[PDB]
Write a protein that binds this ligand. Structure first.
Ligand code: PCA
Length: 301
């Protein structure tokens, strides 16, 4: 059996490095009965397209950024809310709280959640001095999701969505001067050529998820199914591992390259916390009882 797996990120990206090992694990564990071809850097499907591609079984498996789908259902927005889970442990616990509801929602559309891994803690790339939220008014902001567009609007920035595959170009032509993302993305797009500061706000840790079409899964023999699930579990473990481990490497490498890595003032964090509380209120209202259940489970961990 041959499957195709689109990802929106380049070969050098930590999630794709992990996906590369994952496809090798599926081959090895399934004894070669399942071969997955990776289509990287949005070459086959682009970020906004991948969930629909797997839903229709155009690709049997695919990697998405959960928060790209925040407008479709509140469950997708959760790991993009600022100042709710601001480290790897809190992020993993938020994930565990979210997971049953993510799986339920995906199941309603004929998909399975294979594994999910957090991007590194999100900071602000800017050329400006930002000591408080007001210092962000009027920023030419690059969003990578609906939620990150909302955050921009809430700080008075002016966002435009640009996928990572188009980010280097958007910076090089000056359409955007600032954004929130990881040291990972900053490094991989050589953001240091155009933008000189990264405020290490660790505001959230958004996850990617590898989704599988249920019908495609069901067509496989039991051993091959189990090989895929085991490869999936190994991928989750390794992905969280590599995400956290490389985070310090990217920050120090960005510094090597002339970027100022700056811890946020208490004032900047408090202002963004206020934005976060507003967004969580809004989210609870959209999400209803399921939102409350998720937040309760997260707060119990
Ligand atoms: O850290 C991240 C989250 C999504 C991706 C991006 O900037 O598009 N990099």
């Amino acid at each position: 059996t041959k499957w195709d797996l689109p990802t929106a990120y380049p070969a050098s990206n930590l999630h794709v490095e992990n996906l590369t090992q994952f496809v090798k694990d599926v081959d090895s564990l399934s004894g070669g009965k399942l071969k997955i071809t990776l289509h990287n850097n949005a070459s086959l499907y682009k970020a906004p397209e991948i969930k629909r591609a797997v839903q229709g079984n155009q690709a049997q498996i695919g990697e998405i950024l959960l928060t790209n789908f925040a407008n479709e259902d509140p469950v997708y927005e959760l790991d993009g809310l600022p100042f709710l889970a601001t480290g790897y442990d809190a992020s993993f616990k938020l994930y565990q709280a979210q997971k049953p509801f993510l799986e339920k929602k995906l199941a309603s559309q004929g998909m399975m959640l294979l594994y999910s891994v957090a991007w590194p803690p999100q900071g602000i790339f800017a050329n400006r001095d930002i000591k408080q939220v007001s210092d962000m008014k009027g920023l030419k902001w690059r969003a990578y999701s609906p939620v990150t567009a909302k955050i921009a609007e809430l700080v008075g920035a002016q966002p435009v969505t640009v996928q990572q595959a188009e980010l280097a170009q958007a910076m090089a032509t000056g359409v955007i001067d600032s954004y929130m993302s990881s040291g990972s993305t900053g490094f991989d797009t050589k953001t240091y050529e155009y933008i000189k500061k990264f405020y290490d706000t660790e505001a959230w840790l958004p996850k990617n998820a590898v989704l599988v079409n249920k019908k495609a899964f069901d067509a496989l023999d039991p051993a091959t199914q189990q090989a895929l699930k085991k490869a999936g579990a190994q991928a989750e473990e390794r992905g969280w591992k590599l995400s956290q481990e490389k985070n310090s490497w990217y920050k120090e490498q960005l510094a090597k390259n002339g970027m100022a890595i700056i811890a946020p003032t208490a004032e900047l964090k408090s202002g963004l916390t206020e934005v976060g509380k507003r967004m969580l209120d809004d989210w609870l209202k959209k999400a209803g009882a399921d939102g409350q259940a998720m937040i309760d489970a997260y707060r119990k961990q």
